[PDB]
Amino acid sequence: YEHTAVMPNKVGIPYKALVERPGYAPVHLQIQLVNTRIIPSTNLEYITCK
Amino acid sequence: YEHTAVMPNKVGIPYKALVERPGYAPVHLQIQLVNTRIIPSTNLEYITCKYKTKVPSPVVKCCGATQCTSKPHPDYQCQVFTGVYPFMWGGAYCFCDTENTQMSEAYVERSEECSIDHAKAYKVHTGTVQAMVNITYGSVSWRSADVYVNGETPAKIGDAKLIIGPLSSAWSPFDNKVVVYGHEVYNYDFPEYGTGKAGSFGDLQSRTSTSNDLYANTNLKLQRPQAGIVHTPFTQAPSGFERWKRDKGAPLNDVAPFGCSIALEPLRAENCAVGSIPISIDIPDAAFTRISETPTVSDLECKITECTYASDFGGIATVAYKSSKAGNCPIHSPSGVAVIKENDVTLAESGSFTFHFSTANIHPAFKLQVCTSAVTCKGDCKPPKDHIVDYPAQHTESFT
């Protein structure tokens, strides 16, 4: 029942998929990607200022 | 109504057949062959074990020879020796220098471990297989009785008389020749009593533990003690019981075919799931319900709702029960396609009650006999995802 699901990247809205496990009662999802904060890999190269 | 039934040999799962006696209400079975312990015919041929060169203390004649004799001890190796000067606590003690004679003698004897830690050979014949068959029968709901396989033995334990086998699957997982060790059983071509080459298995070969006589081909060869000192060089192969514990073969409860387990107990080979057993029962007629007392269920309808194409009882199906009276109704699929968890279903006046089952064909077109009312529960099933746990309830694979 490991519910794979392709899923649109969009933040503020749930994605209420449905678990179709053969044998027991299905269960809904409610997957709301409340945030997509990224944090790339970076390097402080130099501060500048006046 | 003596319900003959061919029946697959497989241990841990009921076989809920249905008694179709013409005239009275049918009754379900629940035949679970909880065990298939075998206990072939055998013979204790010889215990073996590792020797112990329990040396008798050598003679030392100081000036002249001491001829040895071949005493009847097992593998009584004895060899006279001269040319010693035996240092014993005061330097030497025998005042001669070549006439100093030393007679070494050593025989083989069962270890103390031979009584307890010992391999054990057997000539193994076929014997007669057994089972603690539970039937939670009908409305009887219980009997857990030990039975046989030979096809005329009843066992009137409970109320039902039941005749089993003979099974068609005569594979004794034991070979003809077997060695046995504590619990690990080896279907080994042990050489024989009386012959075993030294170092090889059965260098010591005692009939039993008590048996003072034995066969000890250990290649025990005494050598002369060194440089005029008292001791007994015994040059000998460490036992073929020493090896056979760390250069052995694997156990039959780890290499057998067709699904068996083993015990150093009556020498059974439990739970050997193979083939079928022609089983036949004589039910007590008192346990029957007459036909005019169970509800007639016809004008019904059956349909799957979520069929699981699987082993565990994942298949389900509502049934639009259309009864006449209200009560119980034993159920079964006379086709072996579908195996059902429920033997019996309770009924109000023409309600509906789902049951559980399991199948192997994508389109399960199996009849369902709801207490003398047949119905096709046609439909379609879904494969599962999660297959790593013990053995199935389906056991009905065929062309699909």
Side-chain angles (χ1 to χ4, degrees):
Chain A
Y1 63 89
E2 185 177 1
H3 187 274
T4 301
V6 64
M7 188 175 288
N9 190 0
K10 185 177 180 181
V11 63
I13 191 73
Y15 292 159
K16 294 181 182 295
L18 190 282
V19 176
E20 294 181 354
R21 182 264 181 85
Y24 292 170
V27 178
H28 62 86
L29 277 297
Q30 182 181 6
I31 296 170
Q32 184 177 1
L33 296 174
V34 66
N35 190 358
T36 306
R37 68 179 181 282
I38 292 176
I39 298 170
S41 293
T42 186
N43 297 114
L44 181 63
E45 298 295 328
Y46 64 92
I47 295 170
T48 186
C49 63
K50 64 179 73 175
Chain B
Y1 63 89
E2 184 177 1
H3 187 274
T4 301
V6 64
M7 188 175 288
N9 190 0
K10 185 177 180 181
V11 63
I13 191 73
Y15 292 159
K16 294 181 182 295
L18 190 282
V19 176
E20 294 181 354
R21 182 264 181 85
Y24 292 170
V27 178
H28 62 86
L29 277 297
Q30 182 181 6
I31 296 170
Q32 184 177 1
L33 296 174
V34 66
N35 190 358
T36 306
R37 68 179 181 282
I38 292 176
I39 298 170
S41 293
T42 186
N43 297 114
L44 181 64
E45 298 295 328
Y46 63 92
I47 295 170
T48 186
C49 63
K50 64 179 73 175
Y51 63 89
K52 298 297 293 295
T53 303
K54 293 181 180 179
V55 177
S57 299
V59 177
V60 177
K61 184 176 185 294
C62 287
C63 295
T66 301
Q67 184 177 1
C68 186
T69 63
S70 296
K71 279 72 174 177
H73 295 88
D75 191 75
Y76 182 76
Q77 184 62 256
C78 175
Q79 185 174 359
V80 176
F81 294 101
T82 186
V84 299
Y85 184 72
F87 292 164
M88 186 66 204
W89 184 251
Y93 63 92
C94 295
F95 64 92
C96 290
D97 292 331
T98 187
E99 293 179 353
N100 297 327
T101 303
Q102 188 275 335
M103 183 177 73
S104 301
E105 65 186 1
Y107 64 90
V108 176
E109 183 173 358
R110 296 178 66 252
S111 182
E112 294 83 0
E113 290 183 352
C114 298
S115 295
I116 188 164
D117 181 72
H118 63 277
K120 188 182 286 185
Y122 291 104
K123 292 180 178 68
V124 177
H125 297 287
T126 186
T128 301
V129 303
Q130 294 179 355
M132 296 186 186
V133 177
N134 188 1
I135 300 167
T136 62
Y137 181 73
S139 296
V140 177
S141 69
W142 183 257
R143 62 91 55 80
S144 63
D146 190 0
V147 299
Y148 292 168
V149 66
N150 50 10
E152 66 278 19
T153 301
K156 184 177 184 293
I157 302 298
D159 291 329
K161 182 174 72 67
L162 72 167
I163 297 91
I164 295 93
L167 59 85
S168 66
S169 61
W171 292 270
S172 296
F174 292 170
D175 292 332
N176 189 0
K177 291 182 183 179
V178 177
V179 178
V180 175
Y181 182 75
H183 295 285
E184 293 179 354
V185 173
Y186 295 161
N187 60 3
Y188 182 76
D189 184 78
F190 63 93
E192 187 60 27
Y193 182 77
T195 186
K197 301 293 187 292
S200 67
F201 181 76
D203 62 348
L204 189 152
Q205 295 175 349
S206 295
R207 183 66 60 83
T208 186
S209 65
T210 301
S211 65
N212 290 318
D213 59 352
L214 60 85
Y215 181 76
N217 199 161
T218 61
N219 195 0
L220 183 64
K221 300 294 187 292
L222 295 172
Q223 293 181 357
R224 66 180 175 86
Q226 65 188 356
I229 299 169
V230 177
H231 61 93
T232 59
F234 63 95
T235 61
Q236 183 177 2
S239 177
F241 181 75
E242 191 276 331
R243 67 182 292 275
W244 184 257
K245 291 174 71 174
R246 81 291 183 278
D247 288 329
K248 66 185 182 63
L252 186 65
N253 64 9
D254 293 334
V255 298
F258 64 91
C260 300
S261 296
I262 303 298
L264 188 283
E265 291 188 353
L267 296 172
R268 69 268 188 98
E270 294 87 359
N271 302 331
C272 294
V274 64
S276 296
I277 302 170
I279 296 171
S280 180
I281 298 168
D282 189 0
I283 301 300
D285 193 1
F288 291 166
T289 302
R290 296 180 65 250
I291 190 69
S292 297
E293 290 78 0
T294 61
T296 61
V297 178
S298 178
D299 292 331
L300 61 85
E301 191 275 335
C302 178
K303 65 178 73 66
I304 57 88
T305 60
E306 181 66 27
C307 179
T308 308
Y309 182 71
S311 287
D312 189 0
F313 293 100
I316 60 168
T318 185
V319 176
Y321 293 103
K322 181 67 174 66
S323 66
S324 65
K325 292 181 181 179
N328 295 116
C329 177
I331 60 169
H332 180 73
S333 178
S335 295
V337 175
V339 177
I340 297 168
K341 185 183 286 185
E342 292 81 359
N343 57 7
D344 189 0
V345 64
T346 302
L347 295 174
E349 183 63 25
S350 296
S352 296
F353 294 98
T354 301
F355 63 93
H356 295 285
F357 64 91
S358 65
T359 61
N361 58 354
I362 297 167
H363 293 170
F366 64 93
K367 299 292 183 182
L368 182 62
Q369 184 176 1
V370 296
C371 62
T372 62
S373 295
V375 64
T376 302
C377 297
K378 180 66 173 66
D380 190 359
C381 306
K382 300 294 187 291
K385 294 179 180 180
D386 58 356
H387 306 89
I388 52 89
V389 177
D390 66 357
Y391 294 154
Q394 180 181 6
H395 64 278
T396 184
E397 184 174 1
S398 67
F399 293 98
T400 62

